[PDB]
Amino acid sequence: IVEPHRHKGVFVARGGKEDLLCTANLVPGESVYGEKRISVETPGSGPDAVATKTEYRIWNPFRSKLAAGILGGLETIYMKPGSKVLYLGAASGTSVSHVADIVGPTGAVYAVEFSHRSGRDLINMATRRTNVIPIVEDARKPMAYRMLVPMVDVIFADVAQPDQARIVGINARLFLKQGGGLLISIKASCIDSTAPPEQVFASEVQKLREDKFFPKEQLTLEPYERDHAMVSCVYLQ
Amino acid sequence: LGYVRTMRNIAAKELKELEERYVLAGPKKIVFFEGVEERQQALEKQKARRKQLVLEKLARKVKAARKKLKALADAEYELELQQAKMAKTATSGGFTKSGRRIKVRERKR
Amino acid sequence: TMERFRVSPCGRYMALVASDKKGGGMLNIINVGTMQWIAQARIDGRHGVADFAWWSDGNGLTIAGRDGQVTEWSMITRRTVGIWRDEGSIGGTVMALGGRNGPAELGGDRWVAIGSNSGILNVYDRNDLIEIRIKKYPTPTRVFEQLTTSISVVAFSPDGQLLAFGSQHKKDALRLVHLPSCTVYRNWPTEQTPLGRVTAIAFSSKSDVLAVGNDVGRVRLWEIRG
Amino acid sequence: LFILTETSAGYALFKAIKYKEFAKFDSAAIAVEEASGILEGKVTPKLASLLNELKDEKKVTLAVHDTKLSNSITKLPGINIKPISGSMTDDLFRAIRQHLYNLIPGMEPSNFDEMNLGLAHSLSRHKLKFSPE
Amino acid sequence: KNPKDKRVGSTAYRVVSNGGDPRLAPKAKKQSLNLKQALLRRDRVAKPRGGFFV
Amino acid sequence: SAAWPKAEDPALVQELLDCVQQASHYRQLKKGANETTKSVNRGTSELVILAADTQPLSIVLHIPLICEEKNVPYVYVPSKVALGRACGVSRAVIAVSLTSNEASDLNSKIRALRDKVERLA
Amino acid sequence: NGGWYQEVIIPGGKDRSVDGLVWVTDPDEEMADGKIIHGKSRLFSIGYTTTITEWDLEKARAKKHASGQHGEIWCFGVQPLPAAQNRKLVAGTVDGNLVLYSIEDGDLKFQKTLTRTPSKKTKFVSIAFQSHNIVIVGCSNSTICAYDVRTGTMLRQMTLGTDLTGGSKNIIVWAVKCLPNGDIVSGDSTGQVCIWDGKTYTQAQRIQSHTQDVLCLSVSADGSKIISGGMDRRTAVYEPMAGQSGRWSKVFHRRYHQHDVKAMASFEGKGMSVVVSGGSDASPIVLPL
RNA sequence: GCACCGCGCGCAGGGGGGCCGGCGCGGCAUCUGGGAAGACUCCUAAGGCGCAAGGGAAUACCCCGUGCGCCGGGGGUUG
């Protein structure tokens, strides 16, 4: 049985031994990277009993940074269907499809990915879903896609660079709204592989806090990944 | 060795799927506040069997799959040591039945 | 210790490897006639100095350390002429240096032969080290991979035509190599040449006699005739 | 106070708080030439048709936030007014794009984001042929 | 200093703290300052300090 | 160039080749590009050392993709001939992959060595 | 000109120390009319923390702070002039990683990290630049590394032996500095002063000078005198030996202080060549150079 | 609440302190123990190891002299 979660645009599927996360497919009858999908109809078709309308793609937290946050106890995700999310580090169009299905057709996700092979698979994914726009540019240079990106509501950030807070800082000074949202995934073994991860994460939170965000919460992704944090914070409010 | 390698690949795929399903079944979170007043207000707001059976079942399945993979990995390592012990020239690797470790420092010319 | 040393060919100096490994080995250089310290040559390595050899004119010396770094260190300017690397050596064991008509500012010896702990002995023409600039990555004239255990002895002929290199850890592991052709002689040693486990070799002053002494304690002599 | 705004379609100028003038454009393959022309800072027909007045420089000012574009359009002698770089001009070029919903009834009473999407696809595939396959 | 965190058992609620260093200087790490001294006095011992005193 | 996790420090290169030689004597080593690819794809590989002296460098560039997909650490040493006679081969080995087991002093050395490789990255 | 007037004292707080001081002086800019704007000089410091502080001598307080995710900074220096407006600080630290900070247009921010040592137990204790792109760092594990700043690579790892005077086999290179002709002068844990060749990065001389460890060095502006200050409250003065080149020798030593000589710096201009040595007895001693 | 002719006791918990004594995590110039360890070193001996059969048992453990192999000692004149 499929219920919507506390987060709008996110659904869960419940059974006798399982509980899975899923999203509402914007292109029905199509899968992207080999993901299981469930067909459910709205009730009122007992004599037919055919699952016709709603197609739901199962969101995998072992391949998604954001889906590991939602099953971890993320209180808000700052995005609703019809918002504007800038995705920094869109690795081959895995999670950005689920984010596009969250924001719906009146929302638009702006994917940014410097690496060329993931850019190839990202554009070959992004041809179908029209609510994403892909940008193959270095995320450390925001004035190269300042023409292409309008003001957004949420910044998601999963980039494996040591100046991750600096990339977030320049992209938020050029694109995030007043009182915006930031969901950043921090990698301790990318930033400093010798210090304690608590100290690495505290230094990154302090860098955002001096970078004029307001850290609301931080939670670890540790039934799913190893030494990864998710900082959920607001911008100027 | 080829048979043990194929069975180990199958068993490793089963362990990965079962561990993913066990995690999906079942100082972690930190919330920041500006002050002791807001922390205490959020503390006021905080003041205001089926799963056990199926999770014990998946846990027993996970432990049996880990035992199977560890057994096949030990078998593949023992067969690689058998190859080293039966090589056409003097190759290091493995212990003798007396316990002394075989190590030849010659190079393969 | 005073165990490992080399007297210069001119007889004026003598270099002793100082027993201080610590990621780089030094060797103290002593005037022979008065037995007093006159210099010190320090190279960087991992376990120190594998071997070294005086140049043929008698001024400088070439110090081959372990982990592949080989260092030409002059006596006139009393600092390092240059550093190069043996090709792919995971650690050097022995070195020898011989011939004539080499480079004039590197001692005038033509060939350098460096044997590593795997069993491979590289022979470099020392006119290929000059790019005074030394090439940091020269290529060998010939890489000998005939012996399988670590090269324990290496010795050039005093007229620079032969090169005998041998490993101690195998019974009858000694090879004899022509120069400048760098070809291993195939007719000697045979299966029944009583070398033993070769511990030291020595060519004669006119290079007519090769002496080979093994771990049992028996010297045997071979006339060289061409 | 001439400001120079560049969207995916056209330009706007807010000299006298409220908007003063604009320049609109749509749906061509010379839009990617405009895009490369501001990737460097070269001569641009939309730029020149914007900055071409007939009187004189009347006060030497043109607020453009990237210093590269500023000192590349400094060298053009077609109008000889000299621009200014981004003197931490965050407030201007952030507030105009956040409050750009006020601008939309002015120059292009429409939603022009489909050519923004098309230019994004064109530039990204241009760089994917720059890394050819 | 900083108020210590309060754990409900699952989550940890903590006050942010950066009110220590306004514009003055950052406070020296006592663990690093004692390390550079321990490189300076390796095995050596102090001489007896003063004069005639208990 | 394309060899961006390069091991340039000679102390770290000597540590890598000494651990390669110890694993080679333990028969815990997979030599060659094809055998390295098989160990990384099967997932038995603990660490993987490529060589940067490969004359077409693009014949070992597929292994960084599989290591990025399987989360194993890869590192580049300078000389393939040094890697070859570190394994004890008498050929030039361009990629080697050293595996793990239950309990070893070698496994402790592997954990410390991949910590040093993560310090390089 | 020999007056030595103490002008301003800016005190730090409690539990706050100052370990390193670096002035950053721009070259002489020229106006449109031939007048000379001299270089604006900015003062940077470290305080045994992860933070480089920039001091505002106009307001008599600290101006800026910069910090990256790394260990405590133990030594730092400003890159010398060959670029013109783009000068950068290089800072060694406890856990190894040579962090590199950017200073341009009134800014001090953590730009990146050049490299870090393989061994986590390598602590960077002193740093000095040979040229615009070559940084010479001393370490605690008996090494003097010579990194190259642009690509972040490593030219050569100079090494030093054990100390055979006591225990504690690792020698510690407390102070490196660079001669104008290219050589590197380094005082270390044995009280030695080593002269390292500039082109080859090998040692050319070991001068046993002090009994306890040499804590600070100073090099004359024309490259003619070396001053070494140790922990045996000893100051030694070296001039080159006549004849052979690159050979230094101790002219004379004298105990000027009453405790160890932890820091000294030289100056040579407007008819005044001094070297000021401050130690642990709080008395800055000015020697004529 | 107990004693309204009293201190104190049973209990909820708000904050800070002696930062006294343990625990955890981190670095630690050296020192102590272990493993690994250089190939001149040790490699158990003039013999040993492995694989596959065969025979016997304290029947979980092991021992012994058939067929293939891998080394080693000794002896050993350009085969």
DSSP string, chain D: --B----SS-EEE-------EEE---S-TTHHHHHHHHHHT---HHHHHHH--SS--SS---B-S-HHHHHHHSS-TTT----B--SS-HHHHHHHHHSTTTTTTTS--S--HHHHHHHHHHHHHHHHHHS--
Please give the Cα distance from G121 to B60 (Å, whole number).
43
Q: Which residues of F touch B8 (CB under 8 A)?
A: 42
CB–CB contacts below 8 A, C to G: 44
- The residue written with tokens 């070769």 in the block is C198
Q: 10 Å Cβ neighbour count for C8?
A: 20
- Count H helices and E strands in chain C, helices first: 0, 19
How are strands ordered across the β-sheet holding G214-219?
G214-219, G226-230, G235-240, G248-254
F103 touches chain A (CB under 8 A): no
- Which is it for strands C142-144 and C121-125: parallel, antiparallel or unpaired? antiparallel
Q: Which amino acid is at D112?
A: F
Q: 10 Å Cβ neighbour count for F38?
A: 15
- For residue A190, the chain F residue with the least C-alpha distance is F121
Please give the Cα distance from F115 to A73 (Å, whole number).
31
Cβ atoms of A17 and A62 closer than 8 Å: no
Angle at CA of residue D87, ends D86 and D91, nearest 5°: 80
Q: Is the peptide bond before C180 cis (omega within 30 degrees of 0)?
A: yes
CA-nearest of C153, C88, C99, C159 to C126 is C99
Count of CA atoms in the C-beta half-sphere (13 A) of F94? 16
Q: Which residues of G touch C79 (CB under 8 A)?
A: 197, 200, 202, 204, 246
Are the beta carbons of G203 and C24 separated by less than 8 Å?
Answer: no
> Cα distance from C70 to chain F (closest Cα, Å)?
14
Outline where DSSP puts E strands in C34-182: 36-42, 49-54, 61-65, 69-73, 80-85, 92-98, 111-116, 121-125, 142-144, 153-156, 162-166, 174-178
Count of CA atoms in the C-beta half-sphere (13 A) of A45? 10
Cβ atoms of F83 and F51 closer than 8 Å: yes
Task: Report the SS3 class of residue A48.
Answer: coil
CA-nearest of G219, G143, A127, F86 to C23 is G143
A236 touches chain D (CB under 8 A): no
Contacts made by residues F32-39, CB under 8 angstroms, sequence distance 24+: F32/F93, F32/F94, F32/F95, F32/F96, F33/F59, F33/F60, F33/F63, F33/F94, F33/F95, F35/F97, F36/F63, F36/F95, F36/F96, F36/F97, F37/F62, F37/F63, F37/F66, F39/F97, F39/F99
Q: How does DSSP classify residue G132? A: S
Please give the Cα distance from A157 to A204 (Å, whole number).
13
Please give the Cα distance from D20 to D50 (Å, whole number).
12
> Cα distance from G73 to chain E (closest Cα, Å)?
9
> Cα distance from E17 to chain B (closest Cα, Å)?
8
Cβ-nearest to D98 among A130, A135, A178? A178
Please give the Cα distance from G220 to G230 (Å, whole number).
18
Longest CA–CA span in chain E (Å) reads 60
E12 touches chain A (CB under 8 A): no
CA-nearest of G145, G143, G129, G138 to G89 is G129
Q: At what angle do helices A197-210 and A164-175 cross, to 10 degrees?
A: 30
Distance of CA C201 to the CA centre of its chain: 12
Nucleotide with C1' nearest the F25 CA: H36
Cβ atoms of G180 and G223 closer than 8 Å: yes
Are the beta carbons of B92 and F25 separated by less than 8 Å?
Answer: yes
How close are the terminal C-alpha atoms of chain G, in Å?
A: 14
Where does residue A9 fall: left (phi above 0), alpha (psi -120 to 50 degrees), or beta otherwise? Answer: left
Q: Which residues of A touch D97 (CB under 8 A)?
A: 150-151
Please give the Cα distance from B66 to B12 (Å, whole number).
9
CA-nearest of A73, A74, A132, A75 to A102 is A132
Are the beta carbons of G118 and F8 separated by less than 8 Å?
Answer: no
Contacts (Cβ under 8 Å, ≥6 apart) of D11 = D4, D5, D22, D23, D46, D47, D50
> Cα distance from E13 to chain G (closest Cα, Å)?
24
Q: How buried is A223 (Cβ within 10 angstroms: 0-12 exposed, 13-18 middle, 19+ buried)?
A: middle
Are the beta carbons of B92 and F90 separated by less than 8 Å?
Answer: no
- The residue written with tokens 């000998």 in the block is C144
Q: Which of residues 80-109 of F touch B (CB under 8 A)?
A: 85, 88-90, 101-102
How many residues would you count in chain B? 109
- The residue written with tokens 């400048």 in the block is C180
How close are the terminal C-alpha atoms of chain F, in Å?
A: 15
Please give the Cα distance from G205 to G246 (Å, whole number).
8
Please give the Cα distance from F77 to F53 (Å, whole number).
8
Cα→Cα distances G211→C22, G140, G183, G189, G234, Å: 22, 19, 24, 10, 9
Please give the Cα distance from C93 to D64 (Å, whole number).
67
G151 touches chain F (CB under 8 A): no
Q: How does DSSP classify residue A67? A: H
Angle at CA of residue A145, ends A140 and A146, nearest 5°: 100
Cβ atoms of E33 and G19 closer than 8 Å: no
Are the beta carbons of G113 and A162 separated by less than 8 Å?
Answer: yes
> Cα distance from C173 to chain B (closest Cα, Å)?
12
Please give the Cα distance from G124 to C68 (Å, whole number).
27
Nearest-CA residue to the C1' of H49? B96
Cβ atoms of G220 and G226 closer than 8 Å: yes
CB–CB contacts below 8 A, A to B: 38
Q: How does DSSP classify residue F75? A: E
Q: Which residues of C touch B107 (CB under 8 A)?
A: 118-120, 145, 148-149
Q: How buried is A63 (Cβ within 10 angstroms: 0-12 exposed, 13-18 middle, 19+ buried)?
A: middle
Cβ atoms of D9 and D108 closer than 8 Å: yes
Q: Which amino acid is at G53?
A: T
Contacts (Cβ under 8 Å, ≥6 apart) of C151 = C93, C94, C115, C116, C117, C119, C120, C121, C165, C166, C167
The helix (H) or strand (E) run that includes residue A38 is: strand A37-40
Nucleotide with C1' nearest the G167 CA: H30
> Cα distance from F101 to chain B (closest Cα, Å)?
8
Are the beta carbons of G120 and F119 separated by less than 8 Å?
Answer: yes
Nucleotide with C1' nearest the C167 CA: H39
Please give the Cα distance from F120 to G249 (Å, whole number).
41
Instruction: Write the DSSP assignment of C144-168 as a string of letters.
Output: E----S---EEEE-TTSSEEEEE-T
Cβ-nearest to C67 among F14, F80, F88? F14
Q: How does DSSP classify residue G60? A: T
Å separating the CA of residue A219 from the C1' of nucleotide H68? 64
Q: At what angle do helices B2-25 and F33-42 cross, to 10 degrees?
A: 40
G112 touches chain A (CB under 8 A): yes
Chains within contact range of chain G (3+ C-beta pairs < 8 Å): A, C, E, F
Cβ-nearest to C83 among G143, G200, G204? G200
Cβ atoms of G94 and G120 closer than 8 Å: no
Q: Which residues of G touch C43 (CB under 8 A)?
A: 202
Are the beta carbons of B107 and F88 separated by less than 8 Å?
Answer: yes
Please give the Cα distance from A201 to A215 (Å, whole number).
12
How are strands ordered across the β-sheet holding G184-187?
G175-178, G184-187, G192-196, G203-208
**Resolution given for this structure, in angstroms:** 3.5
D111 touches chain A (CB under 8 A): no
The helix (H) or strand (E) run that includes residue G249 is: strand G248-254
B24 touches chain A (CB under 8 A): yes
Q: Which residues of A touch G95 (CB under 8 A)?
A: 194-195
Please give the Cα distance from C148 to C157 (Å, whole number).
23
Are the beta carbons of B70 and F44 separated by less than 8 Å?
Answer: no
> Using CA of residue G57, residue G58, residue G60, residue G63, what is the dihedral sign?
negative
